[PDB]
């Protein structure tokens, strides 16, 4: 115990006192800083580099002064003291105080407050969504995990342990963001990892735990964090008094405490919503309620993809849902003791579309780079894809099928087997050969559609597939029946619950989602749509109550977006599956000069454009306005070559006269004198090439011009690059 | 710019003092840490200098004989805590905080600046602006 | 409302003891540290020492830095304070208050009524 | 040590006028700056505690401003309540502060 005040003049030595306090130092050691015992001395030197002199002083301490001294009982969360015990590589390397602050500079400005959505002592936890959670079988027995052995274990409730956590939990130390608050010690639950060129995000889940940090490569990082409401948390600053500066977040709740690490709460984030991130955790424990609120923001960004490609306050809402979705989950688990198969099912298909959405839209990058990685100790994935590919391998309606691909889709490391995509093609078919009849889509046929679209787009055979599709998805997408689609997901935002119901994109899906048209959101169609609104009563009521008539045509307009926005935008999705219209170098291609595109065999698509085609055989028809043409391209990979064709005219034969079929394989093109395009018609079967003979006597409106004006035109395009007029 | 490996070794003590400070010979530099389970175990000394234009931090080890310098106000402000312990007591560690406690008031200012965007790696890899 | 009561005083000959007490009224004690604050008669105000939550480090300030003795407990909600020594220029009034945050940037919100110490016989 | 230095020493105005009493300090501390006042008899009261900060029962009238030297205090609308001697406290650096003080006597 030595305290020694010193003062430096040249360079030998320095005049000083010594004031041993309670014990013993060797006062000759002092000559020779000590280094000698098990202590540790202290020397602070102020000396101005002008070579004054100036004073410096000794401080020799002890080394013991360094080392510290359901429910949360048996596995707590322990935050740490300093980086002394724990890891300490970080809080020194770290450029955090020297070149920024992760804090705001203002201490004022950290204190946030809680957001109406967050828990109250009469609502310890939150807001359930109301398809409510099925409780335990009371004399059944809880599998240590979750299995299917059969096809009705995918329908009904399937239930397992949640031992996992109290055995295969791990415990590790959490280093928050730039050494920002000292190490926290938590017992894991589960990790995930999505990540991209524009982002990545990395989430952390944990008994009373989460820490997800939210990283753009075009913005700032924060990092979330959540503790038990006892918690406290001590931020590092660069004033070394022994005081404390609780780090940025709301009051603690009745459950848990939420802490912010970032500088977004006012120099950065556009809004108030500071404390809208901040109270997400503690909106519920149900995972259903945080991907609804994921899902219904995920859609509203990608009619915004117009103005900003890169929606920064849409990535970070989104990422933080995400995250504490799944932190919702294990918490749930937790607490309840008890698992259910579709909920770790799940989580496994909603990070897959969620970060796909997330980084693609909302980031910016390159959908070639998107990928993600999750590991649950409560579910192992590896295990149940191997048991669905024994149950494969072992007439289907479209709820039994949902559920068959959804789970094939939420399991995969890109194997699928052949059962599940010779189902997929059966379900597309089934729902086309339907469309060609009927206008709209039951959301069984809805959630049906997605999962067969997203299994064959999961990966010069499983090429082919996705070509195919693409006409199939965009052949269903109508002028008739696009109005309807784009209805139901307005209808679908409008009577939106966030709190009482789960909102899902497979619920209001439709084949325009999946369809390459860039040519919905023509002032044609959403004038339609706009004439369209009121067959449906109560949505164009709740509509004119808050958006003006001129809102109304933007809205309308903004909802046609996403069926150009969605696949068609895709620039990886087309690069691979029609290299053709990118092979020369094509303006068309990248400007979206290129309206509509149309796969036609292998090497070889159609395609639409409004202005002077530089490549391809061109078919231009004359019947159009000159101002807004119409042009058939038909491209090739290895030919770029300029050109025209002739368009031929065929006639059609009585419909029971050949019973053989050279029609079919086609396509039927109709279109109005305005420009616009209306109905892509792909011939699939003898059955609809024989509907297509009857005029006015078709089940197919677009193959009967007797339900439209007498702008109606009709093209028949051929798999060759062939292209036809029927004389009718 | 010149920059730093964050470490050189030093035999004695003395000569930690007269080491001229690292921010005005160089422009931008990295602090590293030492290669020790404990740091405790391992530890030597604390030699803090204030008037330098980034007032430097350095540890120093005896048997290792190398000092590594780190952040600057992190490292005082973590000392603090360990020995800022209400159970923590005795004589020698009150005289530890009063010097302690105004340390930096003579010295220049944290930073008031914003961190530069990019991708955040975990503490795995420190805090590495890599996406991946 | 929070209301803080001190108790202690009255008059001392020179090199004694003293100590002075402080009562919380409806505040919690455990929270937030709390001052010690001196004003001479004619003079102005002097801050003296701040005890932190609970019992724990406590800085003094110059003047009495090696008379002075503060001690706080969170049962009884007593903070005390100990003059063992210093005779002469200690005379005067004595505060009890509390700071705002625990933090120092904000000084003392609350504050107590008042102690007079005099040095005589 | 921090000293602080209070101007002007004493301020005598009428009912209603704007005083202004600055604070000035030794050291070039940051922000926080702590505003109290005593009515003589009476124990101190806090005012505002950082610089416009002002929150506690005393009426919403006062304010203040500056950064980095020197940080004032400002009374929009004076009042005969307001009579008092007017100290001020550093916050920003600890080892110990406060203001000389300025005494108001209310002028007619």
């Known amino acids: 115990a030595l305290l020694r005040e010193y003062s430096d003049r040249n360079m030998s030595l320095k005049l000083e006192a010594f004031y041993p306090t309670g014990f013993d130092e060797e006062l000759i050691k002092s000559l020779h800083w000590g280094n000698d015992r098990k202590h540790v001395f202290l020397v602070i030197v102020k000396v101005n580099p002008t070579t004054h002199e100036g004073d410096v002083g000794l401080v020799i301490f002890p080394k013991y002064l360094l080392s510290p001294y359901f429910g949360f009982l048996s596995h707590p969360v322990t935050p740490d003291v300093s980086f002394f015990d724990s890891s300490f590589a970080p809080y020194l390397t770290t450029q955090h105080l020297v070149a920024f602050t992760t804090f705001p500079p203002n201490p004022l400005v950290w204190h946030l407050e809680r957001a109406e959505t967050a828990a109250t002592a009469e609502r310890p936890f939150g807001v359930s969504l109301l398809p409510a959670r099925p409780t335990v079988p009371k004399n059944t027995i809880l599998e240590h995990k979750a299995h299917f052995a059969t096809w009705d274990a995918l329908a009904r409730h399937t239930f397992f342990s949640a031992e996992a956590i109290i055995t295969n939990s791990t415990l590790r130390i959490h280093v928050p963001l730039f050494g920002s608050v000292w190490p926290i010690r938590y017992w894991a639950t589960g990790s995930v990892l999505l990540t991209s060129d524009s982002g990545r995000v990395e989430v952390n889940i944990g008994v009373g735990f989460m820490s997800s940090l939210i990283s753009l490569s075009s913005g700032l990082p924060i990092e979330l964090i959540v503790v038990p409401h006892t918690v406290k948390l001590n931020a590092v600053t660069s004033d070394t008094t022994w005081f404390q500066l609780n780090p940025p977040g709301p009051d603690p709740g009745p459950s848990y405490r939420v802490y912010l690490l970032g500088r977004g709460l006012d120099m950065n984030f556009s809004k108030h919503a500071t404390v809208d991130i901040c109270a997400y955790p503690e909106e519920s424990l149900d995972y259903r309620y945080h991907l609804s609120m994921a899902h219904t923001e995920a859609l509203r960004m990608t009619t915004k993809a117009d103005q900003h490609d890169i929606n920064e306050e849409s990535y970070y809402h989104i990422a933080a849902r995400i995250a504490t979705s799944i932190f919702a989950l294990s918490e749930m688990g937790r607490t309840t003791e008890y698992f259910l198969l579709d909920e770790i099912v799940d989580v496994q298909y909603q990070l897959k579309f969620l970060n796909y959405i997330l980084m693609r839209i909302g980031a910016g990058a390159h959908p070639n780079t998107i990928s993600g990685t999750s590991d649950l100790i409560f579910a192992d994935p590896s295990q149940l894809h191997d048991e669905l590919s024994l149950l494969f391998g072992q007439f289907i309606s479209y709820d039994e099928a949902r559920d068959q691909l959804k789970t094939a889709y939420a399991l995969s490391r890109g194997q699928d087997h052949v059962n599940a995509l010779s189902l997929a093609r059966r379900v597309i078919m089934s729902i086309y050969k339907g469309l060609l009849v009927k206008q709209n889509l039951n959301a069984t046929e809805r959630q049906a559609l997605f999962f067969a679209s997203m299994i064959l787009l999961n990966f010069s055979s499983r090429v082919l597939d996705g070509r195919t599709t693409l006409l199939l998805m965009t052949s269903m997408c109508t002028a008739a029946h696009a109005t309807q689609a784009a209805l139901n997901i307005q209808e679908g935002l409008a009577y939106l619950n966030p709190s009482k119901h789960m909102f899902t994109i497979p619920n209001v899906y439709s084949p325009c989602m999946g369809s390459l048209r860039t040519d919905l959101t023509e002032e044609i169609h959403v004038m339609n749509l706009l004439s369209a609104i009121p067959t449906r009563p109560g949505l164009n009521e709740v509509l004119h109550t808050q958006l003006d008539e001129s809102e109304i045509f933007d809205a309308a307009f903004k909802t046609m977006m996403i069926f150009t926005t969605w696949t068609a935008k895709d620039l990886h999705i087309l690069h691979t599956h029609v290299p053709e219209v990118f092979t020369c170098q094509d303006a068309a291609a990248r400007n979206g000069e290129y309206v509509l595109i149309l796969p036609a065999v292998q090497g070889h698509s159609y395609v639409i454009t409004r202005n002077k085609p530089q490549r391809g055989l061109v078919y231009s028809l004359a019947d159009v306005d000159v101002y807004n043409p119409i042009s058939v391209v038909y491209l090739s990979k290895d030919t770029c070559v300029s050109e025209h064709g002739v368009i031929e005219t065929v006639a059609l034969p009585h419909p029971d006269n050949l019973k053989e079929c050279l029609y079919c394989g086609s396509v039927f093109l109709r279109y109005l004198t305005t420009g616009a395009i209306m109905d892509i018609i792909i011939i699939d079967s003898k059955d609809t090439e024989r509907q297509l003979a009857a005029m006015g006597n078709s089940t197919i409106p677009p193959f009967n011009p007797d339900m439209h004006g007498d702008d109606s035109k009709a093209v028949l395009l051929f798999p060759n690059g062939t292209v036809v007029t029927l004389l009718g | 710019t010149p920059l730093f490996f964050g470490a050189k070794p030093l035999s004695d003590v003395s000569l930690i003092i007269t080491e001229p400070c690292v921010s005005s010979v160089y422009e931008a530099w990295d602090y590293a840490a030492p290669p020790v389970s404990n740091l405790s175990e391992a530890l030597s000394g604390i030699v803090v200098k204030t008037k330098c234009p980034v007032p430097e931090v350095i540890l120093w080890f005896k048997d290792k004989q190398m000092a590594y310098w780190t952040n600057p106000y992190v490292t005082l402000k973590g000392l603090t805590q360990s020995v800022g312990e209400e159970h923590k007591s005795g004589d020698i560690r009150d005289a530890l905080l009063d010097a302690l406690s105004g340390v930096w008031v003579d010295s220049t200012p944290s930073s008031t600046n914003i961190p530069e965007n990019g991708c955040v790696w975990g503490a795995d890899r420190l805090f590495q602006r890599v996406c991946q | 409302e929070v209301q803080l009561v001190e108790s202690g005083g009255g008059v001392v000959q020179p090199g004694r003891s003293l100590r002075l007490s402080c009562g919380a009224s409806?505040?919690?004690?455990?929270?937030?540290?709390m001052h010690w604050v001196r004003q001479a008669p004619g003079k102005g105000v002097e801050w003296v020492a701040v005890?932190?939550?609970?019992?724990?480090?406590?800085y003094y300030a110059a003047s009495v830095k090696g008379r002075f003795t503060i001690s706080r407990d969170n049962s009884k909600n007593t903070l005390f304070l100990q003059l063992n020594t210093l005779r002469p220029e200690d005379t005067a009034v004595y505060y009890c208050?509390?700071?705002?945050?625990?933090?120092?940037?904000?000084?003392?919100?609350?504050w107590g009524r008042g102690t007079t110490v005099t040095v005589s016989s | 040590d921090i000293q602080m230095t209070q101007s002007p020493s004493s301020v005598s105005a009428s009912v209603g006028d704007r005083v202004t009493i600055t604070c000035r300090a030794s050291?070039?501390?940051?922000?926080?700056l702590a505003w109290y006042q005593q009515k003589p008899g009476k124990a101190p009261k806090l005012l505002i505690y950082?610089?416009?900060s002002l929150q506690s029962g005393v009426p919403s009238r006062f304010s203040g401003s500056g950064s980095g030297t020197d940080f004032t205090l400002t009374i929009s609308s004076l009042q005969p309540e307001d009579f008092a001697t007017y100290y001020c406290?550093?916050?920003?650096?600890?080892?110990?502060?406060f203001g000389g003080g300025t005494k108001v006597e209310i002028k007619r």
């Open positions: 409806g505040f919690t004690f455990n929270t937030y540290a």
């Open positions: 950082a610089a416009s």
């Open positions: 406290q550093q916050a920003n650096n600890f080892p110990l502060t």
């Open positions: 050291q070039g501390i940051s922000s926080w």
């Open positions: 208050a509390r700071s705002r945050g625990n933090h120092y940037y904000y000084g003392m919100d609350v």
């Open positions: 005890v932190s939550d609970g019992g724990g480090n406590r």
